Each structure stands twice: as structure tokens, then as C-alpha cells.
Amino acid sequence: LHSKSSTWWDEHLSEENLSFVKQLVSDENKTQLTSKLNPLKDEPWPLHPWEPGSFRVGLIALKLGMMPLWTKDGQKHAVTLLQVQDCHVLKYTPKEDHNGKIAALTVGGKTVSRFYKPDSRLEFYRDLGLPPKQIHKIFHVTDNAVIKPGTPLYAAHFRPGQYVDVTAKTIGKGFQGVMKRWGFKGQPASHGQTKTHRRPGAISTGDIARVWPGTKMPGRMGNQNRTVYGLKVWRVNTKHNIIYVNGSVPGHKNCLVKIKDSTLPAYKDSCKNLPFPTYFPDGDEEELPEDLFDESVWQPSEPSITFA
Amino acid sequence: TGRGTSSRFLTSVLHNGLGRYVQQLQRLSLSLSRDAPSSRGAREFVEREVTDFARRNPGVVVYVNPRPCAMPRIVAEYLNGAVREENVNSKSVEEIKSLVQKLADQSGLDVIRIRKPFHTDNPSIQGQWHPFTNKRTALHGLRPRELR
Amino acid sequence: AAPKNRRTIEVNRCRRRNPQKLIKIKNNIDICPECGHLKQKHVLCGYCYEKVRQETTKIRQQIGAQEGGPFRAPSVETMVLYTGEKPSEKDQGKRIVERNIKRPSWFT
Amino acid sequence: SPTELTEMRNDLFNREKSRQLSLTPRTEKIEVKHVGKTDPGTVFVMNKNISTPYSCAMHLSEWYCSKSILALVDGQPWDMYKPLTKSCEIKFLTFKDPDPKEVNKAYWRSCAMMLGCVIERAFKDDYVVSLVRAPEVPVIAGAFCYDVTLDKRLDEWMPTKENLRSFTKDAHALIYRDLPFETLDVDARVALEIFQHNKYKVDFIEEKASQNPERIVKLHRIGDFIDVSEGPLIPRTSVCFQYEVSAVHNLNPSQPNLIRRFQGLSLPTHLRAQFTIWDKLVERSRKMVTED
Amino acid sequence: ISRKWEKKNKIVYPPQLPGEPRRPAEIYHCRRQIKYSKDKMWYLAKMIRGMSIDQALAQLEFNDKKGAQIIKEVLLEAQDMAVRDHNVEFRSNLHIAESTSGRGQCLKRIRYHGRGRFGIMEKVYCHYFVKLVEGPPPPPEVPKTAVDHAKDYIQQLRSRTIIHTL
Amino acid sequence: ISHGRVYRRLGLGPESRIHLLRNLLTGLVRHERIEATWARADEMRGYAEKLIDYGKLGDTNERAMRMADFWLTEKDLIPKLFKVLAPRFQGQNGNYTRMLQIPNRKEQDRAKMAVIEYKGNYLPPLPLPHRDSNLTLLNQLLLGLQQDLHHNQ
RNA sequence: CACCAACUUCCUAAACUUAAAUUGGGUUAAUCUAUAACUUUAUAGAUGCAACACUGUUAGUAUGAGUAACAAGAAUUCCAAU
Ligand SMILES: [Mg+2]
Ligand SMILES: [Mg+2]
Ligand SMILES: [Mg+2]
Ligand SMILES: [Mg+2]
Ligand SMILES: [Mg+2]
Ligand SMILES: [Mg+2]
Ligand SMILES: [Mg+2]
Ligand SMILES: [Mg+2]
Ligand SMILES: [Mg+2]
Ligand SMILES: [Mg+2]
Ligand SMILES: [Mg+2]
Ligand SMILES: [Mg+2]
Ligand SMILES: [Mg+2]
Ligand SMILES: [Zn+2]
């Protein structure tokens, strides 16, 4: 009719084209990714030296899961696995326009399909010459540590030893009661409690004739951006770009996170030893081993630990 | 009732006093009954007052149409086209005479709240006040803090 | 808890005419190529589907008459033949359902 | 001045239409039967030389008007807005038909015609733009090509990317205006008068008139623009949704007169294409495609 | 009871002069005493407003509400009595100009309750009216542009006068 | 709080949910084309395919025979499942059942419906969706691109 | 070294000097009758003679609210069916 119509990519494609289209797109992604595989040989920006007060960029990783880990003291440390996947810097804002004192870089990861994205997002990525990324995030970076847009990022950006901070959306638990959401004690089950077991108590004071804003009430829990600080990096797998981060990281498994250099006072100047802008394998300055370990970590295949 | 009613500005019909004053009342029509107590007062008006009024105002055509009637009615027509009818039921000659004289003097303009007592087409002779009046200029018209 | 005041038609007209309470228009309606009746894109055409089911009922009725009992389902393959058609050699040893009408165009 | 050329041609077009309509007196009912699969057996009584295939769709439903592009009169493709002449059979062809060969060609010629209109009025009045013709290229060619001759003063100038972008904006403006195509059958004598100035158009008119036993010629008007049409065209410009002038390539064997092939792509509202698919097809069109 | 929507279908206008614009047709159809709520019926009536009759006969068919079928029937009676008895040339040259539902005569019954108590139940009916006007649907409302918004503000300021003075 | 819980909640409880699916499955295994509310038809679809897996194992296997009894209320259908349904699907490794959404029910309940069948059934073919032919405008343009690319490759 | 500020007072036209149980006075809406008038009027005679309020009575319609609540085991060859 003479009205607006709903359509999708597959609506019109024929049988033969359906497979061809799903194949042509896959070919283009490989070519685009390869084009950016050499940052240092693609007119890199000047690589200024590190000085005190510098802040680096951070990666976006996928949370594979958890596994156990042991140190040479014999203690077991629960550690989580974070995979860096197609982490490419996207946009570079300047100090003044960013509205902050520091500059800001956007770091996207986890390439996704192109068939179910708004036209605006596809156009922006086409200009950048990279496949679209699932998530965008902003990293506050000093002018010295700026990296040119489109520079691929890898797990070698981090090294064993450095304390790192991870932030991601927490698992969404839906609308929940006051007991579970805020740990309210609740009311007894027996002795006459009639229809009051998990309900909130007295909302507020009677005289004020109102409820204070911000009161703890039943509502949706989870699905909120949260950050964990001071998480040591136990090991770095160069081949699969897997970083081993101590303890628990927010979000469900396969949830994208925002790994970044720790902001705690003790970790103020831990970036000096590590690669200042980032690590460029294409530079081939040094060939790193597949697995990087920390001194305390007990590597597998070593002799069994003896507490002499 | 001011917010509950319409309003207008002071106005005339055709600039009545600029040139020659023209009488606005155009026509008065009075219907009477030969034998009716209510119209008795109006019958006295026709006997004596109507003749004097007709000569005094020669621009008001007067129609008297005695008919078998229950209420005597006076219909006033003005030059702007406005009509006005007032019931004269059981009114003495004194009341009618005073009532008719009001009709002749009034104009067809609506009797509603007049917003302002006065009207002028040229309120200002020396020029309507604007912000730049009484403001001194500066050499070369330099705005404050302009270096030039 | 009981109302403390009657709610005015203006307030009522604000609640029941809110965009959240209106019928959202459907943009997925189309015209079936074969019959021309209306269908949703992600759904089958009722008019065309009704033809298939009506034929299915007739075929199933014929099967019921032949079997004549509850527990009479044949292990061997089933097949349906219409007037003017004879079983092929490859169709030997297959139950045959006979239909008086001619072979429908959609049926192959 | 070019404005004068448009006015006289427009006036000639109106006069030709007026005589044809005046030539037909009274209303004579003609029987036309629906031969399509769905809604079969319907019979419309229509007015001879006045009724159009669009009217036939109007009786049936709004769907036919919206989704029908061409109609098969007695096995021949006819424009939806072209008036009927005699009793016949009518079948409506949508884009999604199993055999859309006729529909594709109609859309193909249509898009390249709108392309020609954009070009002539896009140039500045100082320069001289003349339209020679557009070769019939199979849809598999990957784009529709209109050949345009240019003034010698432009022989050293090739449009940049910005110039190409400007043409599409004008093309989209024509699409947004939603100007229906006007279908007219014109005898060669009148056709030559409307396009006497353009020698190439005159030669094309001669070829068309020679082909048919009579001197009948096909003239299509898109608003102000008037040009000869190889085949039936789309009823409206709004039928196009995606449009793009891929590139323009100078013809290498153009020693006597320089000619530039203007190549573009368009897709109808029905068969819209995703963003990624659109780009790849757009890139292919930039490659110059010869006529076989 | 007052059946005036039925009579309006019988109005006869005087013949037109040779150059007068062709008057668009109007049709007046309705159904009374429908076993449905007038409040529930309004949502269906409101939906179709300002649409064609082959665009309002498609949205209705895929609605789950009971009234959708009822409205569809009176949108097909209207579509037939327009072509036969009101001289509408094309079935697909109509559009729903007006459509609304009105209260009907109801019945009073007793809804029982739990302590020897009760309440008054009303079995609800309604009417549904539609007008169809020959012609494509009037083009939709165009939102005011930023320039238009700015112009009104200037026009508002230009009208300013010095208040409470000569 | 029901994340990763594949099953639905149907019937009067867990056991009832198993007994309603046994009836749709037996009807399917008997008629080969059965209708039900989209939710319940989709719930069975996993159970419908797994019967063929057990049928493929063969009559001799004790586990297949035992399973084919609990999941086939009528006992004249176990011979059919093993000797006609299973031979048909030996070539295939999946996609035993075809499920499509029939329009909503015209009952005043207006529930979403679906028709589930077994592939290769003798009943008249369902009106399946048809994708546009390669000759259509958009389709033809892509084919031209494929040819060009194939030459380039 | 003052201005603003209340019908206090003045001024053009007028007016003739202070919450409520109670107390005196002049008129009026509706209807009937007498006698008239004759598009709805007059002088008299009369009376079931004037309602924003009694958890007033009767009828109608809102609000709460399209809310609380209400109901039919599955498939088919199908509702005096398997
Ligand atoms: Mg407890
Ligand atoms: Mg309890
Ligand atoms: Mg009782
Ligand atoms: Mg009630
Ligand atoms: Mg959950
Ligand atoms: Mg789930
Ligand atoms: Mg005083
Ligand atoms: Mg009383
Ligand atoms: Mg009262
Ligand atoms: Mg009361
Ligand atoms: Mg209500
Ligand atoms: Mg409520
Ligand atoms: Mg409930
Ligand atoms: Zn169909």
C-alpha cells in the first residue's frame, strides 16, 4: 500500500545470493582487518617518551570464564580469563573539545555483524575502515600517550605484575524485593506474622508526612555499570590475547569489560616500566613468548612445590 | 464579568467630529394598541411628544404602526447597521421620552467594556521614546572596550 | 484504600488516551502472491493454508475408512493417488489412498 | 536560450495531447477482462482512449495501484498511465514476479531517463550540454549508462567526487518531487519538430519511425523534461528510493565529438538494499561497462 | 434514542455549474446496540481515523480485539453502499474521514457478593459511526520546523504594545 | 531468575508438562502434521527429533525400545517409528521436523498457533515461504557482481 | 531633610455615614379564577406559590475502573464422535 514498509537484509535476497552475501561480507572483514595490521608502517603519530604523571589507554576484553591458579607459596588464587578481540582505537578527541582536562580516546572491540546496525553506525565505521565493534568506551589519556585512530590493540599492552582495574555491567537480576536487593532482615515466618515475611518495615518517620528521596525500596537489581579496583595481572597469553586477572570481574561470562591501568595511589606510577603508548607486534622490536608469568606464579610442568 | 465578557477600544463610526457631525440614530419604530392598559403610557407619547421629537431630530425616520398588540416595542436602527429593541410595556410618557432621547444620542457601537478612555492616531509629536534616545554617542561610535 | 476524590474527565482523558495505551499500527502486512489475500510476512496465508488443511481432512477421512479400527496404523509407507494415476514400480508395497477428485495443482 | 527550448517543446507536447483527446468524441465502452492469477475473471467496462490501466487497478484495490508497475495488454507491456485503445486482457506485473524481465527493463530505462534530466539542468548556462542517447544494457551490466556530449571547453575538465555528489542530490530532488511520467505516442513529423535542434535525437527519431510500419514514436515527459523512450517506463519517480551516479567516463573513440558516458544505479522502494550491499553494488557501477 | 446519522445519508445538493470543482462524496454508516464497551471500541475507531479503506481494512484484520471484526463489517457495508447508491467510481478512492463509538441502551442486572451483599451490574452496549469521503487520505501533519518555531517567537514580540498608556 | 532454564512451565506441574507433550508427540508420530499453540508445539519440537535418534539406533537396542514405549501412548506406533520414520531419516542427521506459524486462532481465545510436521510426509505440501527468483532486479544485480568477482578470483 | 503608603478626606457625577438572633417597612418570580387584552400583556380575587445543602425520597448518570474477580485436559478422521 501507500504507507511505510518494514524490511530486513534477507527479505529480498534469493537462495544463491543468500550464501554469496553471507560470504562476501566475510571476505571484506578479513581484508579490512589486515589493512590495519601494521600500525608503525602506516604514518604513526610521534612516540613521545614517558614522564611522571602519564596515563595510558586501556583495552576492552571478553570474559571467557574462570579457572584456578597457584603460586610458588602453594596458595590457590581464583583468577578470571579476559580475551582481547579486535580492540582498535576508533576516535581521538582533543583536550579542549573533550570538556575534560585530559584528552580522550575511544576503544572498541568484539567485531559484530553488519546486517542489524543503524545506517549511521555503519557509515562511521566505513570511514574508519574497520569492521563494526560491539561496544564503545572512552579512556582518559594524556597528550603524550595519544595513539592514532585505527591502531589495533593487543593483550601485550599489559604485562604480568601490573595491577589493573576492570569495569562492566553487572548481571541483571530483575525486579527484586527489599530483602534480596538490600539485605533487609525481614519478618519471622511463624508466631502470628500474617502476610508479612519479606516486606519492608516502616518507610520513614511519621511526622515528616513524606518519604525521603533515595529510600531503599523494591526495584530492579543488577545490570548496572560497576568497577573493580586493584586486580593483579597474573599471566598474559600472547597467542590468544588472554590476560589472567585476580579474583572476580563484574558481568556474566562472555560479557565485554573495560580493562584499564589501576588508579589506586599505590599503582600511580606502574605504567613507566610497561610499553608507554602500547605494544606494536608489527614493529617486531622483540619477539615475546607465548605465555608471560609473574615471579611468584608457579608455572605448570615445573617441579612439584616443596616447602623446604 | 470583565474576563467573562468581550471588550473593545474607544471608536467612532466615520470620524464623526472631524468634519460634520452626522446623527447616528437612523430609524425608530413603535407599535401600539388602541385598547390596551399596558400601552396607555405610549399612547400619550404619540399624542404629544412624538411630533416634537420628529422635528427636533430630522435625520431619524419615525414609524408608528398601531396594531393589536400585547407589548409595545421600540426598534432603533443606527447607521452602522446595528439594531436595538427595548420593551416599553407599561411605561409612562416620562419614561419613554427619557428612554428615546438616550437612543438618539447613542451610536451603534457595542455597549461593552471599553479598554481605554482615550484614542489617538498620533499619540506622539516629538517622537515615540526608543531605547537609544537620551543616550550619548561616542567619537567614531566606539562601543565599550573596542580598541579600534 | 479508597479514593479520596472523584477523578475528573480531563485527568481520565489524560490516562486512557496516552500513547502507551493506544493500538500500535502493523507494518508487516502484505499480499499473498497466489490468492491475493492479506498475510503477515512471518506468518502463513490463512486462505492458502485452509486449502491444504481441507484437502488433508479429506485424505485423512479416506484413510480412516480403509483402516476401520483404532490400532491399525500400517508400518509400511503411505501414499495418496488421485483418479487417472496408477502406482509405479518404485511405489510397490505402499499403502494407497484413493481420491475421486483430480490431482490438485499444489499437490505434486 | 535553453529556457526557450523547454517552453516550445512543452507547448508542442500539450498541443499533441490536446488534438488526440479532442480527436476522440463521446465515450465508447470497451470490454477488458482480468487475466491475472488472483482476482480472476473480473471484467471492467472502460472508456476508450480515456481510461488507463491505473484505473483498472483502482477498481480492484489499493494494493494493485501501489505494487503494480506495468501491465500486459494482450501479451504486450504497456505503461500504467498510458490510455487504453481497444478491448484486451490486462495482467499487472509487480517487481517480485517470477519473470520480471519486462518490469526490470521498464525500471532500467526509467532511471537512465531521470539521469538525463538531471545532467542537462545541472550544468551552468555558460556551458553547452547535449544528450545523444543511452545504450540498452542488460541489467547484469551492473549500472545504467547515459551518454552525454559536452562542449569543447569542457574537454579538459572531468567532474570530481563533489560534482558527482551534486548530481545525486538533484536526482533525489526529482525523486522527492514525485513527478509521474507522461506517456505519449507521437508521429515522426511532430517528434522531429520537438527535437529538431538535436541532430542525434533527430537521427534516433528516424530509426524509431523506420522500425514501425507507420511513423509512430514514443515520447515520455518527466515534468518539464521531454525525451524519446525506448520502452514503457515507471509511472512515478517516487518508485525509486536509492539513487546514485557512480561515475562518468569519457568515450575513448570520440575524436569527432567528445561524449561522456554517465553511469548510475537506482533501486525501487520495493527492492530496497541494505547499507553494505548497496556499497558493493555502487562500487561495481563505477567500472565502465561497454554495450554489447 | 435519536437516529440522525441515518438521515444524513439522504441529503440532496443542487446541481453544479459547468466549472465548479467536483464535490467529494460522503457516506454515513453505523451499527447500533453492539455488545461491546464504548470505551473499548474507541481504541479501534481511533486507530483507523485518517486512513484509506484498503489501508484500514488491513490493519483491522490482524487485530485480536472482538470489535475489529465488527468495525470491519461496517467498513465493508460502507464500501459497498458507496459504489452502488452514492455514485463512487472506484472502491479504492475512499478514506475514513470520521469514526467514533457512542453509548447504547444498557441492561441492569445483579452481580452477587460474599456476605449477602451485592452490586449493580450493567450489561454494556454501544454504537459505532463512520464517515467515508471520496479521495486519497489528506497528507499527514508536518511538524513545525525550527525556522517556523523561531518565526512565531519574533511574531509574538512584534505584536508587543506599550500597555496601560496612551 | 530463569536464565538458562531451557524448559517451560506447562500443565499442572512438572509431571503434567511431560504428559501433555507425550500426547502431541503421539499425535505427530501418528498423523505427521499436528497443530498446537506455538509455545507448546515449540516445546515438543526438541522431543520430536530425539525420537528419531532413538529410532535410528534400531529395534534391537533395549534403551531405544524402552524409550519408544514411554513416549508413544498408543502402542501401534512403535512399529511405525522404527520401520518407516527411522529409515526415511537415515540419510539426514538433523532437521527432522518443520515448524511454521499459522495465523492466530479464530476462537475468541486468539492464541498464537503453529503447525509442526515431519519432513517427507505424504500429506499435501504446506504453503512454505518462497524467496524471490534470481531474475528479480535486486537478485539479478548481485549475480552480475558474483560473475565479475568470480572472473577476478 | 523628603518620597511611597488605606473611599480616611478631597475632586467630575453622586451620596447623606458602621458583625448577626431578633423587629418594621416597599416590591417581585410562577399558576389558577373574574373582566379584559390577543406573539403573551392589565387591575383585582386566590394558593399544594420560588431549594447550591436535612448520611432527604425516586429516576438517571459518573468516579474508583475497563480495575477486583469470573472460565473450557490434548490430538484427530472431530459436538448424540475415535
Ligand atoms: Mg528469617
Ligand atoms: Mg505467612
Ligand atoms: Mg446467600
Ligand atoms: Mg459501578
Ligand atoms: Mg532473570
Ligand atoms: Mg529463557
Ligand atoms: Mg468614606
Ligand atoms: Mg412548595
Ligand atoms: Mg434541586
Ligand atoms: Mg438533598
Ligand atoms: Mg466507568
Ligand atoms: Mg488502579
Ligand atoms: Mg486478576
Ligand atoms: Zn494466500
**The C-alpha cell that represents A32 in the structure block:** 579490512
B31 touches strand G (CB under 7 A): no
CA atoms within 13 A on the CB side of D190: 23
A87-93 and A152-153 beta bridge pairing: antiparallel
Sheet containing D225-228: give its strands across. D181-187, D216-222, D225-228
Say yes or no for a CB contact (<8 Å) between D275 and A123.
yes
**C32 marked among binding-site residues:** yes
**What is the Cα–Cα distance from C96 to D242, expressed in whole angstroms?**
55
The data reach a resolution, in angstroms, of: 3.6
For testing the chain A interface, which of D95, D239, D275 should be mutated: the one with the most A CBs within 10 Å? D275
**What is the Cα–Cα distance from B35 to A239, expressed in whole angstroms?**
125
Query: Which nucleotide is closest, CA of C63 to its C1'?
Result: G77
C60 touches strand G (CB under 7 A): yes
**The C-alpha cell that represents E82 in the structure block:** 458507496
Backbone angles phi and psi of A78, in degrees to 5: -65, 130
Q: Do chains F and D touch (3 or more CB pairs under 8 A)?
A: yes
**What is the Cα–Cα distance from A132 to A86, expressed in whole angstroms?**
10
Task: Count interface pairs C-F at CB distance under 8 A.
Answer: 66
**What is the Cα–Cα distance from A243 to A59, expressed in whole angstroms?**
11
**A81-100 b/e with 16+ CB inside 10 Å = b?**
bbbbbbbbbbebeeeeeeee
Burial (Cβ within 10 Å: 0-12, 13-18, ≥19) of residue A158:
buried
Residues of F in contact with E66 (CB under 8 A): 108
Residue C96 Rama label (left phi>0; alpha psi -120 to 50; beta):
beta
| Strand ranges, E, within chain F | 33-37, 97-100, 113-118
**DSSP code of C19?**
G
Query: Which nucleotide is closest, CA of C7 to its C1'?
Result: G63
**What is the Cα–Cα distance from D139 to F138, expressed in whole angstroms?**
10
**What is the Cα–Cα distance from D169 to A87, expressed in whole angstroms?**
37
**What is the Cα–Cα distance from D49 to A143, expressed in whole angstroms?**
77
Say yes or no for a CB contact (<8 Å) between D63 and E54.
yes
**E21-58 b/e with 16+ CB inside 10 Å = b?**
eeeebbbbbbebebebebeebbbbbebbebbbbbbbbb
**The C-alpha cell that represents E72 in the structure block:** 470491519
Residues of A in contact with C28 (CB under 8 A): 6
Grid coordinates 431619524 are at which residue? B60
Q: Answer whether C98 touches D (CB < 8 Å).
A: no
Contact F44, F21 (CB under 8 A): yes
Q: Distance from residue B37 (CA) to nucleotide G29 (C1'), in Å? A: 22
Query: Which nucleotide is closest, CA of C70 to its C1'?
Result: G82
Q: Distance from residue D84 (CA) to nucleotide G64 (C1'), in Å? A: 66
Contact A186, A197 (CB under 8 A): yes
Query: Which nucleotide is closest, CA of F108 to its C1'?
Result: G72
The CA distance from D100 to the nearest CA of chain A, in Å, is 14
Say yes or no for a CB contact (<8 Å) between F104 and E64.
yes
Q: What method was applied to determine this entry? A: cryo-EM
Contact B16, B2 (CB under 8 A): no
**The C-alpha cell that represents A39 in the structure block:** 600500525
**What is the Cα–Cα distance from C38 to B72, expressed in whole angstroms?**
74
Q: Answer whether D269 touches A (CB < 8 Å).
A: yes
Contact A155, A84 (CB under 8 A): yes
3-state secondary structure B30-63: EECCCCCCCCHHHHHHHHHHHHHHHHHCCCCEEE
Count the residues in chain D.
Answer: 292
Nearest chain D residue to A122 by CA distance is D275
Q: List the single residue in E53, E55, E93 with the smallest CB-CB distance to D58.
A: E93
Say yes or no for a CB contact (<8 Å) between F131 and A173.
no
Torsion of CA F54, F58, F60, F65, to 10 degrees: 30
Grid coordinates 531605547 are at which residue? B131
A185 Cα to the center of ligand 1, angstroms: 7
Q: Which residues pair with D173 in a beta bridge?
A: none
Q: Distance from residue B28 (CA) to nucleotide G15 (C1'), in Å? A: 36
Grid coordinates 549511521 are at which residue? A120
3-state secondary structure chain A: CCCCCCCCHHHCCCHHHHHHHHHHHHHHHHHHHHHCCCCCCCCCCCCCCCCCCCCCCCCEEEEEEEECCEECCCCECCEEEEEECCEEEEEEECHHHHCCCCEEEEEEEEECCCCCCCHHHHHHHHHHCCCCEEECCEEEECHHHCCCCCCEECHHHCCCCCEEEEEEECCCCEEECHHHHHCCCCCCCCCCCCCCCCCCCCCCCCCCCCCCCCCCCCEEECCCEEEEEEEEEEEEECCCCEEEEECCCCCCCCCEEEEEECCCHHHCCCCCCCCCCCCCHHHCCCCCCCEEECCCECCCCCCCCCCC
Please name the amino acid found at residue B39.
Answer: S
